[PDB]
């Protein structure tokens, strides 16, 4: 409703770095809000793409940002009559970024890994890897829970069970309020998908440089399955956390699996032991139900609600024709211990190929009316296909069915304006939560400041 579309703030990165692919707000130890931006095709030292991370201080004028420096050098360790190897070329560092406390977690989902032993090998595969930084102190740590030292022949003999070689850990990520990092790994277990969790503190205290293969004890991974409904389901494409079981001492995980059960798509709510509490099945095959998930209480009863994007949903139109426009589903959490029901509301895109629902950002309470609000991205929407972000306001019965405000992309064609979103943080300290919108196609980020209601 009350985001200022006249006076924007633009931050920018190098050409072709995909600056703005991921973003998040970040508070330093003193509460000062900055913007952490991932740029997964930033050039490294060898004039090859490795990705990079930028930490943008808040300035109304925007501009350039200093980089958050990570080690881009390939690593080799000869230990245990084996050779360990990391390959950071085209790893996509900054394909996801998240901030918790004064710590930034930036992940390279396509970092490759191999182990050599005489003539054999583990195979060079994208296990993924996440980099952790405490910017004010300079502390650095890594977390790569899918690296193994098992040789290729063993997986073949054991029929590729518990095969974490293609995890792409850090594809999606989220941190609990208590400081537990949860990584989505859609390629884990031969493309079923897995989750990897470990406390940030234990990641820092168990990491030393040059070990490459190390145990972090509090770590907790999800499980392989023989059920064909999970095959090629990319469980962990998106991830989120929230309170869905009634017990405030437990945190519940929300997992998107957009190709679950032969591309029907699904979203599952779990406990911290990965035991399934509910499953939201997709409505239409190939619609990519679960591409994005968002958790926020929108109707002001204190119970977290769930939003699921299906950016390729094809709407039915006259003369038996379909039109891919995208769709967003709202699930209100019922009172006490009960299953999530049918959706309370369906929001459907209008522009063909607009991909409405590609991203869903909780905004907090934008208009300060007592109900939390959301922003939905259609990165190819709008009458010109340049991209659109639509704001929907919370209300006692859920969400409004029509948007309160639409943000047309200020960038040229192809910027993918809205492919990443982040709200619910007041960056200018004016008492109103603001919205940052990534446009990696233009290598830029746009900041929308919330203003008092007119």
């Amino acid at each position, epitope marked *: 409703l009350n985001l200022d579309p006249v006076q924007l703030t633009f931050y920018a990165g190098p050409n072709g770095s995909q600056f703005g692919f991921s973003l998040d707000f970040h508070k330093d130890s003193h509460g000062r809000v900055a913007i952490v931006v991932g740029a997964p095709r930033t050039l490294g030292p060898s004039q090859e793409e490795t990705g990079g991370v930028f930490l943008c201080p808040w300035r109304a004028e925007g501009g350039q940002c200093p980089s958050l420096l990570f080690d881009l050098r390939d690593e080799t*360790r*000869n*230990v*245990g*009559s084996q050779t360990l190897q990391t390959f950071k070329a085209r790893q996509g560092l900054g394909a996801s970024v998240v901030s918790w406390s004064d710590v930034i977690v930036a992940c390279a989902p396509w970092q490759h890994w191999n182990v050599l032993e005489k003539t054999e090998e583990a195979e060079k595969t994208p296990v993924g890897s996440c980099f952790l930084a405490q910017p004010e102190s300079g502390r650095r740590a890594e977390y790569s829970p899918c690296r193994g*030292n098992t040789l290729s022949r*063993i997986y073949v003999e*054991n029929d590729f069970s518990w095969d974490k070689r293609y995890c792409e850990a850090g594809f999606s990520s989220v941190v609990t309020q208590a400081g537990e990092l949860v990584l989505g790994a859609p390629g884990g277990y031969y493309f079923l998908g897995l989750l990897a969790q470990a406390p940030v503190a234990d990641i820092f205290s*168990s990491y*030393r440089p*040059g*070990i490459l*293969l*190390w*145990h*972090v*004890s509090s770590q907790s991974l999800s499980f392989d399955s023989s059920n064909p409904e999970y095959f090629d389901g990319y469980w962990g494409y998106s991830v989120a956390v929230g309170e869905f079981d009634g017990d405030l001492n437990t945190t519940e995980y929300v997992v998107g699996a957009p190709t679950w059960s032969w591309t029907l798509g699904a979203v599952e709510i779990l406990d911290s032991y990965y035991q399934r509490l509910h499953r939201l099945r997709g409505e239409q095959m190939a619609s990519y139900f679960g591409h994005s998930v968002a958790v926020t209480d929108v109707n002001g009863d204190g119970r977290h609600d769930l939003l699921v994007g299906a950016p390729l949903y094809m709407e039915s139109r006259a003369d038996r024709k379909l039109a891919e426009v995208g769709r967003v589903y709202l699930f209100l959490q019922p009172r006490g211990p009960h299953a999530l029901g049918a959706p309370s509301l369906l929001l459907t895109g209008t522009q063909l190929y607009g991909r409405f629902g590609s991203a869903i950002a909780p905004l907090g309470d934008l208009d300060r009316d007592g109900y939390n609000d959301i922003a939905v991205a259609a990165p190819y929407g709008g009458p010109s296909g340049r991209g659109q972000v639509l704001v929907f306001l919370g209300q006692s019965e859920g969400l409004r069915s029509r948007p309160s405000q639409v943000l047309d992309s200020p960038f040229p064609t192809g910027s993918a304006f809205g492919f990443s979103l982040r709200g619910a943080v007041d960056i200018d300290d004016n008492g109103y939560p603001d919205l940052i919108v990534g446009a990696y196609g233009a290598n830029q980020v746009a900041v929308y400041r919330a203003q008092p209601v007119v």
Partner: antibody
Amino acid sequence: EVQLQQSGAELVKPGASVKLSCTASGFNIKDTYVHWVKQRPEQGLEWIGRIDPANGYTKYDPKFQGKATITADTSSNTAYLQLSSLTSEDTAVYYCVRPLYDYYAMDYWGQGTSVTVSS
Amino acid sequence: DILMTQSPSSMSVSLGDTVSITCHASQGISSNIGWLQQKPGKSFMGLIYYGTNLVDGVPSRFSGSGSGADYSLTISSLDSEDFADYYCVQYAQLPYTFGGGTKLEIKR
């Protein structure tokens, strides 16, 4: 905490066979490698082998092939060292070891199991 | 196999001294070395892993250093409890091999 409670001291005759145990206290023995080390005053420390209790795959020093056999039961969270065709040279203290962080390290040690072969 | 020649066999020292044990390997091991402590009539305690990294709970007066095939364990300002045996162990190759041992004894 991480603790490795080994079995009590053993007293056997040459040619017999003994099975020592190493129980993981405070953690899952499936987490890391588990090694076995033999100690003698003159010969010092010698590495017998390791097992990965997650899958049961083992490694051995060729010196101990046929002599030693290492197994593990994830159920009881326990790892075992079997010694067969015992002789006087097998009279030693045996330790189970596991790393702290580094996959290939040797950081945590059991109290040791004393073995004595004699007729 | 890789031979681990640990020196010296023993040394008589006093409380507060700064002493240094060394360990020479028959070939390069790339800091894939650990340091161990065995208090008399008791089991083992890990001190160092990967050449320089302290095991959790070890005092800071312990430290490791070296590269290639020559490494050192140093104890700055000896404590009464620091009189025991110390062994190096390499894990650059299988089989793992140990050093002969070093006994720190009270000088008098």
